[PDB]
Design a protein around this motif. Structure first.
Motif, PDB file in Angstrom:
ATOM      1  N   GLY A 237       0.801  -1.214   0.000  1.00  0.00           N
ATOM      2  CA  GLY A 237       0.000   0.000   0.000  1.00  0.00           C
ATOM      3  C   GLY A 237       0.836   1.268   0.000  1.00  0.00           C
ATOM      4  N   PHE A 238       2.147   1.120  -0.176  1.00  0.00           N
ATOM      5  CA  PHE A 238       3.066   2.249  -0.119  1.00  0.00           C
ATOM      6  C   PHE A 238       3.909   2.316  -1.372  1.00  0.00           C
ATOM      7  N   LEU A 239       4.577   3.446  -1.553  1.00  0.00           N
ATOM      8  CA  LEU A 239       5.542   3.581  -2.625  1.00  0.00           C
ATOM      9  C   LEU A 239       6.654   2.572  -2.387  1.00  0.00           C
ATOM     10  N   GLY A 240       6.993   1.811  -3.422  1.00  0.00           N
ATOM     11  CA  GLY A 240       8.062   0.837  -3.335  1.00  0.00           C
ATOM     12  C   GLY A 240       7.671  -0.468  -2.671  1.00  0.00           C
ATOM     13  N   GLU A 241       6.373  -0.741  -2.564  1.00  0.00           N
ATOM     14  CA  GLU A 241       5.915  -2.074  -2.181  1.00  0.00           C
ATOM     15  C   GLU A 241       6.556  -3.135  -3.074  1.00  0.00           C
ATOM     16  N   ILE A 242       6.899  -2.747  -4.300  1.00  0.00           N
ATOM     17  CA  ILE A 242       7.775  -3.538  -5.159  1.00  0.00           C
ATOM     18  C   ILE A 242       9.005  -2.697  -5.450  1.00  0.00           C
ATOM     19  N   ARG A 243      10.187  -3.292  -5.334  1.00  0.00           N
ATOM     20  CA  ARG A 243      11.413  -2.556  -5.606  1.00  0.00           C
ATOM     21  C   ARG A 243      12.537  -3.424  -6.155  1.00  0.00           C
ATOM     22  N   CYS A 244      13.370  -2.810  -6.989  1.00  0.00           N
ATOM     23  CA  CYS A 244      14.476  -3.497  -7.642  1.00  0.00           C
ATOM     24  C   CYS A 244      15.785  -2.770  -7.365  1.00  0.00           C
ATOM     25  N   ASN A 245      16.880  -3.311  -7.890  1.00  0.00           N
ATOM     26  CA  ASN A 245      18.201  -2.728  -7.679  1.00  0.00           C
ATOM     27  C   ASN A 245      18.532  -1.670  -8.721  1.00  0.00           C
ATOM     28  N   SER A 246      18.126  -1.925  -9.962  1.00  0.00           N
ATOM     29  CA  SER A 246      18.518  -1.098 -11.096  1.00  0.00           C
ATOM     30  C   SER A 246      17.302  -0.629 -11.879  1.00  0.00           C
ATOM     31  N   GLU A 247      17.551   0.169 -12.911  1.00  0.00           N
ATOM     32  CA  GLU A 247      16.492   0.637 -13.789  1.00  0.00           C
ATOM     33  C   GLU A 247      16.018  -0.512 -14.670  1.00  0.00           C
ATOM     34  N   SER A 248      16.973  -1.244 -15.234  1.00  0.00           N
ATOM     35  CA  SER A 248      16.669  -2.350 -16.134  1.00  0.00           C
ATOM     36  C   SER A 248      15.866  -3.445 -15.438  1.00  0.00           C
ATOM     37  N   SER A 249      16.122  -3.644 -14.149  1.00  0.00           N
ATOM     38  CA  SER A 249      15.411  -4.655 -13.378  1.00  0.00           C
ATOM     39  C   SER A 249      13.927  -4.305 -13.237  1.00  0.00           C
ATOM     40  N   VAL A 250      13.625  -3.014 -13.109  1.00  0.00           N
ATOM     41  CA  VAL A 250      12.240  -2.548 -13.035  1.00  0.00           C
ATOM     42  C   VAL A 250      11.546  -2.743 -14.375  1.00  0.00           C
ATOM     43  N   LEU A 251      12.221  -2.342 -15.448  1.00  0.00           N
ATOM     44  CA  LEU A 251      11.671  -2.475 -16.794  1.00  0.00           C
ATOM     45  C   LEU A 251      11.454  -3.935 -17.175  1.00  0.00           C
ATOM     46  N   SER A 252      12.317  -4.810 -16.666  1.00  0.00           N
ATOM     47  CA  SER A 252      12.242  -6.238 -16.967  1.00  0.00           C
ATOM     48  C   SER A 252      11.383  -7.036 -15.979  1.00  0.00           C
ATOM     49  N   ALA A 253      10.972  -6.403 -14.881  1.00  0.00           N
ATOM     50  CA  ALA A 253      10.215  -7.078 -13.827  1.00  0.00           C
ATOM     51  C   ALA A 253      10.959  -8.321 -13.348  1.00  0.00           C
ATOM     52  N   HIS A 254      12.280  -8.205 -13.261  1.00  0.00           N
ATOM     53  CA  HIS A 254      13.149  -9.346 -12.998  1.00  0.00           C
ATOM     54  C   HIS A 254      12.925  -9.888 -11.590  1.00  0.00           C
ATOM     55  N   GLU A 255      13.020 -11.207 -11.447  1.00  0.00           N
ATOM     56  CA  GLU A 255      12.680 -11.872 -10.188  1.00  0.00           C
ATOM     57  C   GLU A 255      13.569 -11.487  -8.999  1.00  0.00           C
ATOM     58  N   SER A 256      14.683 -10.809  -9.259  1.00  0.00           N
ATOM     59  CA  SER A 256      15.542 -10.315  -8.184  1.00  0.00           C
ATOM     60  C   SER A 256      14.891  -9.156  -7.433  1.00  0.00           C
ATOM     61  N   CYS A 257      13.911  -8.514  -8.059  1.00  0.00           N
ATOM     62  CA  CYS A 257      13.219  -7.394  -7.440  1.00  0.00           C
ATOM     63  C   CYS A 257      12.386  -7.873  -6.261  1.00  0.00           C
ATOM     64  N   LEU A 258      12.489  -7.156  -5.149  1.00  0.00           N
ATOM     65  CA  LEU A 258      11.750  -7.500  -3.947  1.00  0.00           C
ATOM     66  C   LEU A 258      10.314  -7.034  -4.088  1.00  0.00           C
ATOM     67  N   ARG A 259       9.420  -7.644  -3.320  1.00  0.00           N
ATOM     68  CA  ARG A 259       8.047  -7.172  -3.262  1.00  0.00           C
ATOM     69  C   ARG A 259       7.354  -7.651  -1.998  1.00  0.00           C
ATOM     70  N   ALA A 260       6.359  -6.890  -1.558  1.00  0.00           N
ATOM     71  CA  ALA A 260       5.589  -7.251  -0.378  1.00  0.00           C
ATOM     72  C   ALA A 260       4.787  -8.519  -0.656  1.00  0.00           C
ATOM     73  N   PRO A 261       4.403  -9.244   0.406  1.00  0.00           N
ATOM     74  CA  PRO A 261       3.580 -10.448   0.252  1.00  0.00           C
ATOM     75  C   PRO A 261       2.099 -10.127   0.074  1.00  0.00           C
ATOM     76  N   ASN A 262       1.381 -11.011  -0.610  1.00  0.00           N
ATOM     77  CA  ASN A 262      -0.054 -10.853  -0.834  1.00  0.00           C
ATOM     78  C   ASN A 262      -0.403  -9.526  -1.497  1.00  0.00           C
ATOM     79  N   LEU A 263       0.297  -9.210  -2.580  1.00  0.00           N
ATOM     80  CA  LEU A 263      -0.014  -8.024  -3.367  1.00  0.00           C
ATOM     81  C   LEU A 263      -1.117  -8.328  -4.374  1.00  0.00           C
ATOM     82  N   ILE A 264      -1.118  -9.551  -4.898  1.00  0.00           N
ATOM     83  CA  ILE A 264      -2.095  -9.952  -5.901  1.00  0.00           C
ATOM     84  C   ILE A 264      -3.309 -10.616  -5.253  1.00  0.00           C
ATOM     85  N   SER A 265      -4.469  -9.983  -5.407  1.00  0.00           N
ATOM     86  CA  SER A 265      -5.731 -10.545  -4.944  1.00  0.00           C
ATOM     87  C   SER A 265      -6.305 -11.461  -6.011  1.00  0.00           C
ATOM     88  N   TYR A 266      -6.966 -12.529  -5.577  1.00  0.00           N
ATOM     89  CA  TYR A 266      -7.518 -13.519  -6.495  1.00  0.00           C
ATOM     90  C   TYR A 266      -9.003 -13.750  -6.299  1.00  0.00           C
TER      91      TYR A 266
END
Length: 428
Positions: A237-266
């Motif tokens: 619910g905050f800025l950076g609930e998902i975050r990466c190390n680099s610019e390319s990692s954000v653009l690529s949605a690379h699995e090294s990027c951290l993210r909060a748990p239970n972000l995706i509702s089903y």
């Protein structure tokens, strides 16, 4: 003069040479710095009431440049989920394999996507069984799900807070004589001046609640303040609930990027499925904080040229000024006044080391000096005139028992006749 301090009598020593006097500032004075755009004046008081001088200290700007600390990257993303249902005891849909799912294991139902280096998670929801759901087994089926995150925009944003805020203080000094100079003062800096030196006794300027402020950077666009300090850990619910190390990692949605748990509702609806996320759009947060802003009395603007982030005070400045004075001399007093003088007496000796004592009765409307030269131009006289009548005396050397010398005195510069005379005596 927003803040005026009178020059202390302790640091000040002055002496009169008649007509005008010169005071010598020797000591240290502590004054509150003037507000932004205002002056912090030091009034020098002389012996007379009408004798005043000023040292004016204008505050140009109070700049707080940022030294950045912790920092993560972020961007926009969207969830897309894949679903494949199997009846109970079919495929992986066995006794307890569903409810005992693990998020990192990709189901055999999705053994076709191949290899992915993208942020992804796995789920398994038990749906209704029985022939009402196309299953031979009345027991719950297993809706296997494979979801991931893909970047929405083809650009990223860098976030950061500031470990430290370097304060630079630009000042415009107007000396007592009227000469003007401009310097820059840091917290530990000590600049020198025409009258001594100057430094910051105390510097309290800084970002109050910098632990309650964070900042965003869009590469090659600008920056943005968030009404919230830096989140060193991804919070939902905050800025950076998902975050990466680099610019390319954000653009690529690379699995090294951290993210909060239970972000995706089903919403598992039998064979149907709707995976959604309510993410803080960081590109919206930046626009809200498009760089020119006002928090407290600080206007946050971007570094002209080499890009960084700075803050500028608007009002009062929380810093003392040490004014060190090294016996600096300042003048000036009033104009000379005309003086009426009359010869009193000439008592003394001739050609002796003691000499002769001549007295005059001088009258003026102010403290001054009287200057008289004799016709020869050989002997001259200097005596103090004053606001009123005073009898002054000094030593004058003659060399002839009978004296009758006509002088020409003037306090204001207009020579006027006076006849001294006397019978000089011997010493032997």
């Amino acid at each position: 003069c927003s803040e005026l301090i009178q020059a202390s009598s302790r640091i000040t020593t002055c002496s009169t040479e008649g007509v005008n006097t010169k005071c010598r500032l020797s000591g240290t004075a502590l004054i509150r710095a003037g507000s932004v755009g205002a002056e912090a004046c030091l009034m020098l008081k002389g012996v007379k009431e009408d004798q005043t001088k000023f040292l004016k200290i204008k505050t140009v700007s109070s700049e707080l440049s940022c030294r950045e600390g912790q920092s993560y990257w972020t961007g926009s993303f969207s969830p897309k989920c894949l679903s494949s249902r199997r009846c109970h005891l079919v495929g992986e849909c066995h006794v307890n394999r569903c409810l005992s799912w693990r998020d990192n294991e990709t189901s055999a139902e999705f053994s076709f996507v191949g290899e992915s280096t993208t942020m992804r998670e796995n789920k398994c929801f038990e749906q209704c069984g029985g022939w009402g759901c196309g299953c031979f087994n009345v027991n719950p089926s297993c809706l296997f799900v494979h979801t991931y995150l893909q970047s929405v925009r083809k650009e990223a944003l860098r976030v950061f807070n500031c470990i430290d805020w370097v304060h630079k203080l630009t000042l415009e000094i107007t000396d007592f004589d009227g000469s003007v100079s401009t310097i820059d003062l840091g917290a530990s800096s000590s600049r020198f001046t025409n009258w001594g030196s100057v430094s910051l006794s105390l510097d309290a300027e800084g970002i109050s609640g910098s632990n309650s402020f964070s900042f965003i950077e869009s590469p090659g666009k600008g920056y943005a303040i968030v009404d919230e300090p830096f989140s060193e850990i991804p919070r939902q619910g905050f800025l950076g609930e998902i975050r990466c190390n680099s610019e390319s990692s954000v653009l690529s949605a690379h699995e090294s990027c951290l993210r909060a748990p239970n972000l995706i509702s089903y919403k598992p609806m039998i064979d149907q499925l709707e995976c959604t996320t309510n993410l803080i759009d960081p590109f919206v947060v930046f626009e809200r904080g498009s760089l020119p802003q006002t928090r407290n009395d600080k206007t946050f603007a971007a570094s002209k040229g080499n890009r960084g982030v700075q803050a500028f005070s608007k009002g009062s400045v929380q810093a003392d000024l040490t004014l060190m004075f090294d016996n600096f001399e300042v003048d000036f007093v009033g104009a000379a006044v005309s003086c009426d003088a009359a010869f009193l007496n000439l008592t003394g000796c001739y050609s002796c080391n003691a000499g002769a004592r001549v007295c005059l009765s001088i009258t003026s409307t102010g403290t001054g000096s009287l200057s008289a030269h004799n016709k020869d131009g050989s002997l001259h006289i200097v005596l103090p005139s004053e606001n009123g009548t005073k009898d002054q005396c000094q030593i004058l050397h003659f060399t002839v028992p009978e004296v009758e010398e006509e002088f020409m005195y003037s306090c204001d510069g207009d020579e006027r006749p006076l006849l001294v005379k006397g019978t000089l005596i011997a010493i032997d």
